Amino acid sequence: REIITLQLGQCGNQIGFEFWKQLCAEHGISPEGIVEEFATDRKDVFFYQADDEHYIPRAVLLDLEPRVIHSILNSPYAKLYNPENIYLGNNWASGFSQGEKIHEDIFDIIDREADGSDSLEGFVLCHSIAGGTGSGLGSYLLERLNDRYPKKLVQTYSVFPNQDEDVVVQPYNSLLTLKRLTQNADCVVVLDNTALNRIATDRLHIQNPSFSQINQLVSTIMSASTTTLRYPGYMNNDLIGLIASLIPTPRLHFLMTGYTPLTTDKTTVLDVMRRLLQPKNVMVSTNHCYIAILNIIQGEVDPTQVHKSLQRIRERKLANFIPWGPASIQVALSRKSPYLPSAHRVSGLMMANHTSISSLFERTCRQYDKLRKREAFLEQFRKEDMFKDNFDEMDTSREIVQQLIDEYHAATRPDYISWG
Amino acid sequence: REIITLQLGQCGNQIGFEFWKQLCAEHGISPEGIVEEFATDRKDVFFYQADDEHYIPRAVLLDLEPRVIHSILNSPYAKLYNPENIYLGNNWASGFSQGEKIHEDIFDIIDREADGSDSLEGFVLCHSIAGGTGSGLGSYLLERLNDRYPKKLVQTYSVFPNQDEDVVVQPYNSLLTLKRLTQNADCVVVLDNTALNRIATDRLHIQNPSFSQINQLVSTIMSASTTTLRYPGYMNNDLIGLIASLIPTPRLHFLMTGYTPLTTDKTTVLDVMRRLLQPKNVMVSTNHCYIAILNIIQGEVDPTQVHKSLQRIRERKLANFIPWGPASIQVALSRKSPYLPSAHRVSGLMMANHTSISSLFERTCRQYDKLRKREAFLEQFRKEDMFKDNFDEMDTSREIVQQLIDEYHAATRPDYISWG
Amino acid sequence: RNMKDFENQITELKKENFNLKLRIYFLEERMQQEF
Amino acid sequence: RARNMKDFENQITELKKENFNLKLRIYFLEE
Amino acid sequence: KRYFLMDQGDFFVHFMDLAEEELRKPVEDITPPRLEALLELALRMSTANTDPFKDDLKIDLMPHDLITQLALSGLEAFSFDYIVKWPLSLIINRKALTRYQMLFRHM
Amino acid sequence: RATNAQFDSPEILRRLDVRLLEVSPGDTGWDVFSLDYHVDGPIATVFTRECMSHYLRVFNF
């Protein structure tokens, strides 16, 4: 079945909207939704059919307060992403509860715009993990969405706050959302801003702009990580099966992406994944493993050097990974989006459940713990005081995420049935 | 399986930069490093394929004094030596302690040579003697390579500034390296700059460039010596195999250079060997036996009648052939490239062990004693007396150079196991 | 993969397809006669 | 004494293919 | 290739999103007009819609659950047929397309 | 594949192949590795059974 999407935090709205703008610009889709384009492609998976042959983006925008969202709406794309959901605080409690005071549309839209489907397979959130508007907001959405649709998917692509280093509410708001994400989401594809700036500085020099350049890669990669659904091949055109192939555990579902050309905007299937499986080409910053590695082939779509290719990866080792059991790796032969030019035709993308993310869970845990045990940076806000009166709800997150770092270490070791 | 090379100290680096130009003039690679000349020979061991068609050489080049290193960085031959393998001192001790303080990041270059390769095969240092930026740095870097990659060679070509007297620290710098050239290096192809100065000014009567004219001998000798890396053969497909029978016994690896057509800038099948054992290429300027003899032959040389050649020397006894035992010729043969500015192609080159070079080691002993007994011509910077207080390593080096004299003459004994 | 029993392994592939062909000959020659 | 090895790892296949191929033709021929 | 070798991997997601009412019922309740209508709809809603020979295509039935090696609808019994023409029957032909349908059953 | 002989022709680089030699009660890999060398076509009268047999008997030495 077809899929629905959401976008939250001023950052999360920006990357969700720029994703949908690039996603439109790679399909045969006219700026007013019409599938008239000559530039072949099942738009029905992510775009909703309407009677004007409007293939409308199933986009649930979710800021808190309107500063960003109108400068988002004014575009050459304003009529396209139109489910009539454009309704409107810097702290997780404000994001959470100033959404919750108005759940009767900016959460009931989960059903009100289910008419935006013939029948959903589920939801794809874009979440700013500590974004002062979106963090908190995404978590009440996420925990209540399990009550409305326990039968259907809830993936999140989440942008993670790490800025070389700071904002004094950021570690709090990030660690609060991670507890909800790990308990209530089905998959949480994390995006390291630090690693995306390392990619931008290995490409050229741009570290000081530390976000706007990331938006380019994230828009093209959020499209690319749905391109496997939206254009036919033999297998994995469906998100339910695509993501099932990576996630062997109900809680540690943290995918991370990698991509062979640093420049996203001739070399064999033996070799394109050999670049992809290197420390500099993956969005990250000991005994560690990837619990799965889906990877994608285009350009040299050689049908038969694939079975040989992993033996060549094995012979010069490259990707070491072996947990308590079989970690899945898949070499998905794929296709061009039918609008696009053929620039950097020979290419590879990966998505992998990298056990190393425990290191960033530990970093945000420590950054929470120093500012919590100094007891000064609770910020005294009114929603933070009425939902979270003695700030034990701060530590309620930390009891699970501090467990969760050791859980990923135990999920790396041979015997995770002894649960951390 | 590539022998990595480590040019070091400005003396070593000016034979090095001349050597890369001399190699690129005759080998099948463009001045920018591309396979491009004209429009079938063993690049791999010494040069290997990049993504932009540059065949990456194994070519690290380092010293302390940046006197002119920037020109080596911005030169067009940097586009030959792509890996950015150049990193930034006249006294042995300052050069060595600069080595100590930079020793991790200069070992780090080996990984960039390995990424410019398939895999390791040991090391050649084009090692400055009597030039602290190498006659000190190199003795340190040697003491780091040899214990970490013991499986293959860590050979050190000693270009040796003895010039009949430049810098007045030469006996001290050479003696402090001579502990390393005996018992921390494992092959030492040794080049007396006095013999190279006299011989180069006999190629043509220009006696002005004191070291450039030396480079012009060394680079041509080096190019003939690298043929075993650059050319295929049933035998003679690596440099260790060329060096092997020339070292007669383990600490005595002081291999003197010898080349027949030093005016190469048509010698017969006899004379590639007969001219090779004579004052024109005995690179020294009373028992002085050759301890071992072997050569590489190149050009349009007659491949069969070489059996005639040593059977002439059997009567002439030019090798002064009464050592502990024979270690005689193995007649390696290799082709000469097209395109190059050809003269006297038909030729032979040896790196033999000859008890004449004992006289050089005795001359630097005399230069050392005639200064040391007076405390004379130390650089007298107030930064020694801090790493060597009681001169115990200087005493160790002097007893090891006296052992080097005693061992070279003991190389004629009935049992070489007999001591001095 | 011993090679020194390919003598048997190929003799099986030989005798299998031989027996199959002659057995299909036995059944087609039945069809021929019955019709 | 000798065999090519590359002969074995084909001479199986050229019988093996048409064997089960003829099998599967004949299932429908039994009627 | 699109149907039998399933080069269309966006076709049968529709078929399974539609035919669950078929894929469960006891023996002899076979209903081929419903199967042809399910094919026609699973074609139309998908991109599978787009090729011209989909109308030369058909739903057929198979009796045997791979036990040919030597309704209970679909799982043991699916078949498709790109219909023959006598001029074409010298190459693409039913008698040979039997072997082809066995590969499709497995896939 | 990573040799610089990669510039040789595809026909001669396909004429080479790999095989196990004649056996003994005692053997090793450095005595059993060899080419097989298929020679069919007209060159089956340039090369010949006796010459290839004598080459391959020489090869292991």
Check if the beta carbon of residue B62 is closer than 8 Å to that of residue B137: yes
Helix (H) or strand (E) holding A5: strand A2-8
Residue type present at position B38:
F
For chains D and E, CB pairs below 8 A equal 11
Distance CA A13, CA A159 (A): 11
For chains C and D, CB pairs below 8 A equal 30
* Cα-trace Rg, chain E: 14
Could you tell me the end-to-end alpha-carbon distance of chain F, in angstroms, rounded to an integer?
26
Q: CB of B53 within 8 Å of any CB in chain F?
A: no
Q: How far is D8 from chain F (nearest CA, A)?
A: 12
- A140 burial via Cβ count (<10 Å: 0-12, 13-18, 19+): middle
Chain C residues with beta carbon closer than 8 angstroms to that of D26 = 24, 27
Residue A6's nearest CA partner among A133, A142, A196, A104 is: A142
Q: Alpha carbon of B373 to those of A36, B368, B369, E61: distances in Å?
A: 97, 8, 6, 108
Q: How many CB atoms lie within 10 A of CB A316?
A: 9
Distance CA B181, CA E39 (A): 83
Residue A279 tokens, joined: 């420390």
Q: How many CB atoms lie within 10 A of CB A69?
A: 21
Residue type present at position C14:
K
* Cα-trace Rg, chain B: 21
Question: Which residue, chain included where needed, has tokens 């070799």?
Answer: A271
Check if the beta carbon of residue A362 is closer than 8 Å to that of residue A405: yes
List B55's β-bridge partners, or say none. Answer: B49
Distance CA A315, CA F2 (A): 15
The partner residue sitting opposite B118, judged by closest CB among F2, F4, F5, is F2
Q: Alpha carbon of A239 to those of A102, B114, B365, E42: distances in Å?
A: 31, 41, 79, 19
Provide, for chain D, the percentages of residues in helix, strand and coil under a 3-state DSSP scheme, each rounded to the nearest 5: 70, 0, 30
Binding-site residues of A for GTP sit at 130-136
Chain B residues with beta carbon closer than 8 angstroms to that of F5 = 40, 232
Helix (H) or strand (E) holding B256: strand B254-256
Q: How far is E104 from chain D (nearest CA, A)?
A: 14
Q: Do F5 and B43 lie within an 8 Å CB cutoff?
A: no
Q: What angle do CA B127, B130, B135 make, to 5 degrees?
A: 45
Residue E41's nearest CA partner among E63, E59, E62 is: E59
Check if the beta carbon of residue A124 is closer than 8 Å to that of residue A3: yes
Q: What are phi and psi of B61, to 5 degrees?
A: -140, 115
Helical packing angle, E94-106 and D8-29, nearest 10°:
110
Q: Alpha carbon of D18 to those of A38, B301, D26, E94: distances in Å?
A: 47, 60, 12, 19
Check if the beta carbon of residue B340 is closer than 8 Å to that of residue B265: no
Q: How far is F10 from chain B (nearest CA, A)?
A: 15
Q: How far is D7 from chain F (nearest CA, A)?
A: 10
Q: How far is F18 from chain D (nearest CA, A)?
A: 9
Distance CA B80, CA A219 (A): 38
Chain F residues with beta carbon closer than 8 angstroms to that of B2 = none
Q: CB of F2 within 8 Å of any CB in chain B?
A: yes
Helical packing angle, A92-100 and A170-184, nearest 10°:
50
Q: b/e map of A72-86 (b: 16 or more CB within 10 Å)?
A: beeeebeebbbbebb
Check if the beta carbon of residue B46 is closer than 8 Å to that of residue B113: no
Distance CA A60, CA B259 (A): 80
Question: Which residue, chain included where needed, has tokens 């009660």?
Answer: F25
Residues in chain D whose Cβ is within 8 Å of chain E: 21, 23-25, 27-28
Q: How far is D19 from chain E (nearest CA, A)?
A: 12
Q: Do A41 and E47 lie within an 8 Å CB cutoff?
A: yes
Q: How far is E8 from chain A (nearest CA, A)?
A: 6
Residue B112 tokens, joined: 């960039």
Q: Do F36 and D6 lie within an 8 Å CB cutoff?
A: yes
Resolved by: cryo-EM
Binding-site residues of B for GTP sit at 130-136
The partner residue sitting opposite F2, judged by closest CB among B40, B41, B44, is B44
Check if the beta carbon of residue A350 is closer than 8 Å to that of residue A276: yes
Show the DSSP H helices in B4-91 as ranges.
Answer: 9-26, 69-74
SS3 A70: helix
Helical packing angle, B392-409 and B170-183, nearest 10°:
70
Q: CB of E67 within 8 Å of any CB in chain D?
A: no
Show the DSSP H helices in A63-108 as ranges.
Answer: 67-73, 92-100, 103-106
SS3 B290: strand
Chain D residues with beta carbon closer than 8 angstroms to that of E99 = 21, 24-25
| Parallel, antiparallel or unpaired: strands A120-128 and A153-160 | parallel
| Residue of E13, E17, E18, E41 to mutate, testing the A interface (most A Cβ within 10 Å of its Cβ) | E13
Distance CA A419, CA B273 (A): 76
Distance CA B135, CA E84 (A): 87
Q: b/e map of B102-138 (b: 16 or more CB within 10 Å)?
A: beeebeebbebbeebbeebbbbbbbbbbbbbbbbbbb
Q: CB of A232 within 8 Å of any CB in chain E?
A: yes
Q: CB of F3 within 8 Å of any CB in chain B?
A: yes
Q: CB of B43 within 8 Å of any CB in chain F?
A: yes
The single-letter DSSP state of residue B77 is: G
Q: CB of E106 within 8 Å of any CB in chain D?
A: no
* Cα-trace Rg, chain F: 14
Chain B residues with beta carbon closer than 8 angstroms to that of F3 = 44
Q: Alpha carbon of B342 to those of B263, B338, E66: distances in Å?
A: 11, 9, 75
Residue type present at position B310:
L
Alpha-carbon dihedral sign for residues B16, B17, B23, B28:
positive
Q: What are phi and psi of A160, to 5 degrees?
A: -105, 130
DSSP-derived secondary structure for B186-227: S-EEEEEHHHHHHHHHHHSS----TTHHHHHHHHHHHHHHHH
Contacts of A325 (CB under 8 A, 6+ apart): A248
Q: Alpha carbon of C7 to those of C10, D7, E35: distances in Å?
A: 6, 12, 52
Distance CA B257, CA B192 (A): 9
* Cα-trace Rg, chain C: 15
Distance CA B81, CA A26 (A): 41
Q: How far is D8 from chain C (nearest CA, A)?
A: 7
Residue F23 tokens, joined: 């056996």
Q: How many CB atoms lie within 10 A of CB A42?
A: 22
Q: Do D6 and F38 lie within an 8 Å CB cutoff?
A: yes
Q: What angle do CA A211, A212, A217 make, to 5 degrees?
A: 90
**F abuts D (3+ Cβ pairs < 8 Å):** yes
Q: Do D23 and E70 lie within an 8 Å CB cutoff?
A: yes
Distance CA B275, CA B259 (A): 8
Report the half-sphere exposure of B233 (CA within 13 A, side-chain side): 20
Distance CA B159, CA B193 (A): 7
Q: Do E99 and D25 lie within an 8 Å CB cutoff?
A: yes
Q: What angle do CA B404, B407, B409 make, to 5 degrees?
A: 110
Binding-site residues of A sit at 130-136
List A191's β-bridge partners, or say none. Answer: A159
Q: CB of D6 within 8 Å of any CB in chain F?
A: yes
Q: Do E70 and D27 lie within an 8 Å CB cutoff?
A: yes
Question: Which residue, chain included where needed, has tokens 């062979």?
Answer: A260
Residues in chain E: 107
Residue B125's nearest CA partner among B69, B211, B56, B63 is: B63
- B225 burial via Cβ count (<10 Å: 0-12, 13-18, 19+): buried
Q: Output B394-401 pairs: Cβ under 8 A, ≥24 positions apart.
A: B394/B175, B394/B176, B396/B179, B397/B175, B397/B176, B397/B178, B397/B179, B398/B175, B398/B365, B398/B368, B400/B178, B400/B179, B400/B182, B400/B183, B401/B175, B401/B178, B401/B182, B401/B361, B401/B364, B401/B365
Chain F residues with beta carbon closer than 8 angstroms to that of B44 = 2-4
For chains D and F, CB pairs below 8 A equal 12
Q: CB of B335 within 8 Å of any CB in chain F?
A: no
Check if the beta carbon of residue A349 is closer than 8 Å to that of residue A295: yes
Search chain D and give the residue with CA nearest F37.
D4
Binding-site residues of B sit at 130-136
Q: CB of E68 within 8 Å of any CB in chain D?
A: yes
Check if the beta carbon of residue B231 is closer than 8 Å to that of residue B28: no
Q: Do F38 and D1 lie within an 8 Å CB cutoff?
A: no
Residue A26's nearest CA partner among A301, A257, A226 is: A226
Distance CA B188, CA B89 (A): 23
Q: Do D11 and C16 lie within an 8 Å CB cutoff?
A: no
Q: Do F36 and D4 lie within an 8 Å CB cutoff?
A: yes
Q: Do E9 and A235 lie within an 8 Å CB cutoff?
A: yes
Residue A295's nearest CA partner among A305, A280, A310 is: A310
List A62's β-bridge partners, or say none. Answer: A8
Alpha-carbon dihedral sign for residues E70, E76, E82, E83:
positive
List B350's β-bridge partners, or say none. Answer: B258
Check if the beta carbon of residue B9 is closer than 8 Å to that of residue B133: yes
